[PDB]
Write an enzyme that holds these catalytic residues in place. Sequence first.
Site, mmCIF file in Angstrom:
data_model
loop_
_atom_site.group_PDB
_atom_site.id
_atom_site.type_symbol
_atom_site.label_atom_id
_atom_site.label_comp_id
_atom_site.label_asym_id
_atom_site.label_seq_id
_atom_site.Cartn_x
_atom_site.Cartn_y
_atom_site.Cartn_z
ATOM 1 N N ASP A 35 1.752 1.327 1.536
ATOM 2 C CA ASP A 35 0.403 1.213 0.804
ATOM 3 C C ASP A 35 0.828 1.760 -0.803
ATOM 4 O O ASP A 35 0.979 2.983 -1.123
ATOM 5 C CB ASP A 35 -0.552 2.532 1.102
ATOM 6 C CG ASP A 35 -1.744 2.486 0.186
ATOM 7 O OD1 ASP A 35 -1.740 1.487 -0.864
ATOM 8 O OD2 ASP A 35 -2.710 3.340 0.433
ATOM 9 N N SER A 199 -2.517 -6.883 -16.804
ATOM 10 C CA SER A 199 -2.213 -8.686 -16.776
ATOM 11 C C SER A 199 -2.935 -8.876 -18.329
ATOM 12 O O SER A 199 -3.800 -8.479 -18.867
ATOM 13 C CB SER A 199 -3.275 -9.180 -15.792
ATOM 14 O OG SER A 199 -3.373 -10.417 -15.771
#
Length: 330
Positions: A35, A199
Amino acid sequence: STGSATTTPIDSLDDAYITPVQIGTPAQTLNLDFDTGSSDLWVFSSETTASEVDGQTIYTPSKSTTAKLLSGATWSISYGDGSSSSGDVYTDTVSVGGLTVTGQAVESAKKVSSSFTEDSTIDGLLGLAFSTLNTVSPTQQKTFFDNAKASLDSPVFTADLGYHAPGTYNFGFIDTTAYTGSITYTAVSTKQGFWEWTSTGYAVGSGTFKSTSIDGIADTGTTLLYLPATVVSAYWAQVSGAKSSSSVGGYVFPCSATLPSFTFGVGSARIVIPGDYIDFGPISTGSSSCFGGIQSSAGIGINIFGDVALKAAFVVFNGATTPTLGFASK
């Protein structure tokens, strides 16, 4: 040194990925959920309340000759999905795919929430976010990667998750045969403890790419792609019959639909998520309404590039002095 281990979807929908991890002496092999969105290595154990164990493999520290109780240490974690676990702490030898850390903090669960009990395929979590998020008290502990870093050939690990298929986590090296084109690296903020990056925008199917900064985290422990409501609305508007369902808790769509792809930007580069990666199947057994794999982050406070996005890419988690993230198509 390096390590390499295969990671496998837990079910037919790629709801999560498990990777075998050796703990203790002699080895006890548990299948852990790696994770990158958290920083605790915790396991189902011989200490876990019996009614909360339903098929998981347990770590038994009393059978490990290298296990040492970390005196006075406890841990307690609550995840974004509402699940939680807590317990005490041992140090023990932990190995992943040939790479060994002695003295790793292994957080032994005394309590897990119902969703962990109900998932017999996940024996615990191996956190790979930054050690500043580790929950051990009163002395915070380091992640497996943090402990291994200095020994690795290069201070990196890579995630290559498969769609309906096995994939690989590598530590200490970049397999240059595992991706196409080049790896584009992008800046990371560690201020929230995550692999948080920006992004450069998105496109839906064959549509026009929209340049817009989307701050979010690279999170292998989250199944879906959580993005701003404007972006998610633009995606599902291209799917006939899709709508946001209050009872279901997100966008759903006719199971007969063929989904468009979703592209996200990494610098000037582009990662294309095929449409079928966005189909999470019937909302309930036998339903012809299907759950979408792109959902709104509006109630979260942060965008999450979970497995839906990451499995479309080869992803480098670069733990250099200034960490960065790399993405390549594959």
